[PDB]
Amino acid sequence: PLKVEKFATANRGNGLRAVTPLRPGELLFRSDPLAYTVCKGSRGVVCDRCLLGKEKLMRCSQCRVAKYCSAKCQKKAWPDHKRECKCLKSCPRYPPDSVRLLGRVVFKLMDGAPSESEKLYSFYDLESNINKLTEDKKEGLRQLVMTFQHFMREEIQDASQLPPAFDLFEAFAKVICNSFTICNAEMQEVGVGLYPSISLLNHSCDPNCSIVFNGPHLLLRAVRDIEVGEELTICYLDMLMTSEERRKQLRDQYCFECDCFRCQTQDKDADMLTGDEQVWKEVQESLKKIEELKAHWKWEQVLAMCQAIISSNSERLPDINIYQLKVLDCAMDACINLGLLEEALFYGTRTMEPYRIFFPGSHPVRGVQVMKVGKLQLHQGMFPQAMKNLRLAFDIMRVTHGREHSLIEDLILLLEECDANIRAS
Numbered sequence: 462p463l464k465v466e467k468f469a470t471a472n473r474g475n476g477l478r479a480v481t482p483l484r485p486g487e488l489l490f491r492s493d494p495l496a497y498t499v500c501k502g503s504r505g506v507v508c509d510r511c512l513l514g515k516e517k518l519m520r521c522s523q524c525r526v527a528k529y530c531s532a533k534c535q536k537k538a539w540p541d542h543k544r545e546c547k548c549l550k551s552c553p554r555y556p557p558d559s560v561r562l563l564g565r566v567v568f569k570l571m572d573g574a575p576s577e578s579e580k581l582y583s584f585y586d587l588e589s590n591i592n593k594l595t596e597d598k599k600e601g602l603r604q605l606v607m608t609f610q611h612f613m614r615e616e617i618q619d620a621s622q623l624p625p626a627f628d629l630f631e632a633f634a635k636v637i638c639n640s641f642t643i644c645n646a647e648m649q650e651v652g653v654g655l656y657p658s659i660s661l662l663n664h665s666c667d668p669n670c671s672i673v674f675n676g677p678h679l680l681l682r683a684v685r686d687i688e689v690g691e692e693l694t695i696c697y698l699d700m701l702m703t704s705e706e707r708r709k710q711l712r713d714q715y716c717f718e719c720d721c722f723r724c725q726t727q728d729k730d731a732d733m734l735t736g737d738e739q740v741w742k743e744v745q746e747s748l749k750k751i752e753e754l755k756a757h758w759k760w761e762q763v764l765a766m767c768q769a770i771i772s773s774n775s776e777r778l779p780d781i782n783i784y785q786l787k788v789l790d791c792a793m794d795a796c797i798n799l800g801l802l803e804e805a806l807f808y809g810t811r812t813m814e815p816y817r818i819f820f821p822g823s824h825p826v827r828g829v830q831v832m833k834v835g836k837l838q839l840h841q842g843m844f845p846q847a848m849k850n851l852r853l854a855f856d857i858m859r860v861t862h863g864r865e866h867s868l869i870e871d872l873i874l875l876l877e878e879c880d881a882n883i884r885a886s
């Protein structure tokens with residue numbers, strides 16, 4: 462039986478609420494996507510199907526755009542790739558991610574059996590916020606509609622090839638406020654998908670639930686105690702954002718004004734912005750390029766830019782400043798991927814206290830970060846320190862990831878290895 466149910470909220474549209482009392486870590490729902498694709502930066506880096514990285518991927522011979530880790534993935538992906546394949550081949554132009562995503566929505570709705578992803582709420586039901594769109598946003602959606610019509614012309618010529626009364630403008634409006642960014646085990650963004658049942662969850666800047674991805678598969682878990690009838694919330698946004706930054710994104714993407722306690726009080730903003738404003742404004746600007754490079758897996762270039770900040774001859778920022786913290790995290794991940802494990806541990810350890818502050822309670826991003834640090838410590842022989850961090854990662858990740866997520870198995874192996882080392886000491 463389901464532990465969650467759809468309901469009509471008083472002022473947030475539809476939402477999801479608890480049917481039974483829920484405890485931290487309880488699995489509330491799990492879902493494959495209605496439709497999903499690899500994101501722009503990870504195309505050709507991770508498998509189109511399973512979203513895992515590999516040194517060499519094999520390409521679809523027909524379109525040479527879709528790429529896969531294995532014959533198994535390429536073959537299993539064929540039914541959901543077959544129609545877009547003809548469109549991608551007809552396109553050296555590659556569509557925006559949202560256009561490729563909507564193509565897969567249309568093909569799934571036209572050719573696929575009813576999707577379990579739509580059990581609680583369907584693509585047809587999703588919020589569009591059309592009456593809140595500003596004119597500039599409408600113009601952007603009109604351009605996406607025309608982009609879709611161009612890209613899909615080989616497979617979709619008339620309304621007979623779309624679901625009944627399907628409106629492409631409305632569909633793109635739904636995609637804007639209902640797309641989920643799929644993250645790999647290391648918390649790198651790798652894809653985008655629609656999960657219409659999960660789209661019932663409203664946003665909170667201090668939520669009681671959390672989602673995590675295991676490949677394209679989404680797990681929804683409680684991260685606080687939740688009472689019968691209490692609304693379930695997730696945080697739509699990166700935690701390393703000020704209330705002004707959250708306000709802008711919640712308006713621009715989601716068309717709402719957040720009334721939560723954190724927004725009313727600018728909770729943590731001042732700490733997030735400590736240090737000299739001229740310095741952090743420059744770092745924030747540099748992070749556009751750093752994050753672009755990271756999205757494309759260009760670790761050597763990421764690291765060079767990060768070192769120029771972290772070890773600048775010029776003025777520096779405290780590690781609790783969120784822009785400095787993002788630079789440290791990018792540098793850590795670059796060092797891990799480049800095998801510079803001593804340097805990775807230096808940056809990673811510096812992030813630990815800021816992460817404790819900015820990811821309160823049980824948050825999967827902190828769990829993964831702590832696990833990465835513990836793993837670095839374990840393989841450099843720091844057994845007691847590694848064990849403390851691996852146990853802390855497990856305390857978080859038992860709640861945020863759970864036994865159904867494969868990363869928990871990897872963590873259990875690290876704990877057993879570290880424990881065996883301490884026992885032989």
Ligand SMILES: C[S@@+](CC[C@H](N)C(=O)[O-])C[C@H]1O[C@@H](n2cnc3c(N)ncnc32)[C@H](O)[C@@H]1O
Nearest residue numbers: 473474475588638660661662663664715716717
């Ligand atoms: C992923 S949908 C959530 C389900 C949605 N309420 C519905 O009726 O389908 C995101 C949209 O829900 C609304 N929403 C989500 N969180 C909200 C909040 N804290 N306050 C007001 N509206 C919210 C906004 O319309 C937002 O664009």
Ligand SMILES: CS(=O)(=O)N1CCC(NC(=O)c2cc(C3CC3)on2)CC1
Nearest residue numbers: 638639640641642696697698699825826
């Ligand atoms: C744990 S996280 O910090 O790494 N996390 C947060 C940023 C991103 N979130 C979303 O894509 C998203 C979208 C929605 C609703 C459809 C609106 O809810 N969440 C994924 C990763």
Ligand SMILES: [Mg+2]
Nearest residue numbers: 586587588589
């Ligand atoms: Mg509606």
Ligand SMILES: [Mg+2]
Nearest residue numbers: 474590591592
């Ligand atoms: Mg409305």
Ligand SMILES: [Zn+2]
Nearest residue numbers: 508511530534
């Ligand atoms: Zn694969």
Ligand SMILES: [Zn+2]
Nearest residue numbers: 521523524546
């Ligand atoms: Zn193809």
Ligand SMILES: [Zn+2]
Nearest residue numbers: 666719721724
């Ligand atoms: Zn808020």
